[PDB]
Design a protein around this ligand. Structure first.
Ligand SMILES: O=P(O)(O)OC[C@H]1O[C@H](OP(=O)(O)OP(=O)(O)O)[C@H](O)[C@@H]1O
Ligand SMILES: Nc1ccc(F)cc1C(=O)O
Ligand SMILES: Nc1ccc(F)cc1C(=O)O
Ligand SMILES: Nc1ccc(F)cc1C(=O)O
Ligand SMILES: Nc1ccc(F)cc1C(=O)O
Ligand SMILES: [Mg+2]
Ligand SMILES: [Mg+2]
Ligand SMILES: [Mg+2]
Ligand SMILES: [Mg+2]
Lengths: 344, 347
């Protein structure tokens, strides 16, 4: 017989939950049956205990069972996401969002899950004239006609509203901050997944491993929830139900070391102008980081029909990402995406 | 600017708060400005980080500042409390309440802070079944104290601004640092006490808060988990005197008490527990009496600490003798009757 006092007691006692308990909690939360105080207690207690991959899998799984799906057979088998936990506290430019446009322009289907923020990916896309607010059918059409779509989290996860409000009221990051990347309603099988929390990246990787995804979970060793250019990054490579953790250094591909301030963003307008600069061919630290993350996504996608080995896949990813920019394909794709939105 | 994200982030990092942060959080909670989610996040985060005496002192001090006080010059200088955190999970007979009556009958003024269970039957519930009026305001508690030798401050009467916290406590069910606040926020501010703690890891923090106040207190945890001095085994006692704490292991066998079993101290509903009080005050021998005598002696020892630093073993011997005499002279049974009579005179 599950209950709040039982589950919360177990977590405050610093014990892992029994199987099913996390799912019960999340389902109470998703059906509107949990009091705000219970939601907050659970989010915090799970965080301070240190969630396991099995527990987070229950959370994300239950949350997905309440999401609006995309229609049958509208998401290609090899679609990729580019998305992070956020909360790295460094207010960067929208690296994942820029990378996603570049990856799509390179010919890889992209279905990005995202949200508002502090200009978040959704805010920046909105400021660029992209329609962020589309329902399942129109997202699937975006994907078919433009090669990219965007699932706005509030539109696809209406039942999460009680949790979202508690997250706003308490402000502190929790286990819930992990769920965004794990509950893309289109369920792409590949992804470049950023984690700001060094010790939870491994947990996120474990969740993806139990899905058969081909994913790179990445954490900049400077704290970025992206592949960084200022130093090394830790990568948890996920494929075939297993994890291969490694240290990644972009100097090995000839990237100059950048400073973190050179990647700082601003409001929606500033971050939109940064997008247009990069897609127009402006060289510099921001382009470098976009190219780096776009290549990472391309590598994860390569992991699905896994011909290539790691190094050759990276070399191919970097070349495709750079060419997608330099040939104007990325600029053109964004314009195409905006036109699509404007056609009703 | 203190804020929830700043304070909760600190706690979730496993760091002690900066000075004043716990006080800010408690101000928010006591003014109705903290959302239920913020209250619960804070209660839980403070519990899992492991609260310090300074943090809990801030919570308790702000809480006391919002409480109704007794009127000026109505609490004796040497009043004592006998109270625990509850939450030992054992559902015993009301040991603290029985001890309080015996202690007052031995001539030590008692002002008890308490509440309902709100089960099977808390101190407040049992007193009510005995015909004691638990629901009295400051002026009448003061009068009871002067006329009978004992008073009872009903927590919801004296701490109305705590209602947001109390509702959250009930919603989450799980024990938190807030479970420590009852014993630390007696609105009469007695300076001595026998204080039970059901959570062994937190008894030392409670002690530290009493030490910062220069109270004479024994904070006790039965090694069987009871928030009282037990007779089923040894107890841990943090003795607070002269603004300092030292930890002791206490064995009642050394005063000639036989070992009892938990079930010999098991409670029932308010009526059953009332009958247990009446049996003990009537002079019935057995394990409930033994437990009451022991806890009464402890409060008497704490009270003696106000004006002494007398030797431990003699202090206990006299405490136990005074508690036994209070029952066996009829004084305790008589005191309860005087207390019941006082409440009936109010109309
Ligand atoms: O319901 P629980 O969490 O187990 O708590 C049981 C009782 O212990 C505390 O009181 P106190 O020590 O004043 O009363 P008692 O020892 O006489 O019952 C609390 O206020 C309850 O009255
Ligand atoms: N971080 C996220 C990533 C994707 C998403 F859809 C939502 C969030 C979020 O935190 O609100
Ligand atoms: N329902 C939601 C789902 C995801 C999210 F990030 C926010 C909301 C919200 O209601 O604010
Ligand atoms: N106000 C209160 C003060 C103390 C307490 F224990 C409970 C309440 C309550 O409202 O239930
Ligand atoms: N346990 C307690 C001891 C004294 C008090 F005033 C309140 C409580 C309580 O938690 O309701
Ligand atoms: Mg990102
Ligand atoms: Mg980021
Ligand atoms: Mg008690
Ligand atoms: Mg007790």
């Amino acid at each position: 017989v599950p209950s709040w006092p039982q589950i919360l007691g177990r977590l405050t006692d610093n014990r892992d939950l029994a199987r099913g308990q996390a799912a019960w909690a999340m389902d109470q939360i998703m059906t509107g049956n949990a009091r705000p105080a219970q939601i907050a207690a659970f989010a915090v207690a799970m965080t301070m205990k240190a969630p396991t991959a099995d527990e987070v899998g229950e959370l994300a799984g239950v949350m997905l069972s309440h999401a609006h799906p995309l229609p049958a057979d509208t998401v290609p088998d090899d679609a990729v996401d580019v998305v992070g936990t956020g909360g790295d506290g460094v207010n960067t430019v929208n690296l994942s969002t820029m990378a996603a446009i570049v990856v799509a322009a390179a010919g890889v289907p992209v279905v990005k899950h995202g949200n508002r923020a502090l200009s978040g990916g959704a805010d920046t896309l909105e400021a660029l004239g992209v329609r962020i607010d589309l329902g399942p059918d129109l997202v699937a059409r975006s994907l078919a006609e433009v090669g990219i779509g965007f699932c706005f989290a509030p539109r696809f996860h209406p039942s999460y509203r009680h949790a979202a409000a508690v997250r706003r009221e308490i402000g502190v990051p929790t286990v819930f901050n992990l769920l965004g990347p794990l509950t893309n309603p289109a369920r792409p099988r590949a992804g470049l997944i950023g984690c700001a929390f060094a010790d939870l990246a491994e947990v996120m990787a474990g969740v993806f491993a139990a899905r058969r995804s081909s994913v790179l979970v990445v954490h900049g060793d400077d704290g970025l929830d992206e592949l960084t250019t200022t130093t090394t990054s830790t990568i948890w490579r996920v494929a075939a139900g297993s994890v291969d953790k490694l240290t990644f250094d972009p100097a090995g591909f000839g990237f100059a070391r950048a400073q973190l301030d050179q990647l700082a963003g601003g409001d929606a307008q500033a971050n939109a102008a940064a997008v247009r600069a990069v897609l127009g061919g402006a060289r510099g630290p921001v382009r470098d980081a976009v190219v780096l993350n776009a290549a990472g996504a391309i590598v994860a996608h390569a992991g699905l029909s896994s011909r290539a080995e790691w190094l050759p896949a990276w070399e191919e990813g970097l070349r495709r990402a750079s060419a997608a920019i330099d040939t104007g394909a990325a600029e053109q794709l964004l314009a195409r995406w905006v036109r699509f939105g404007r056609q009703i």
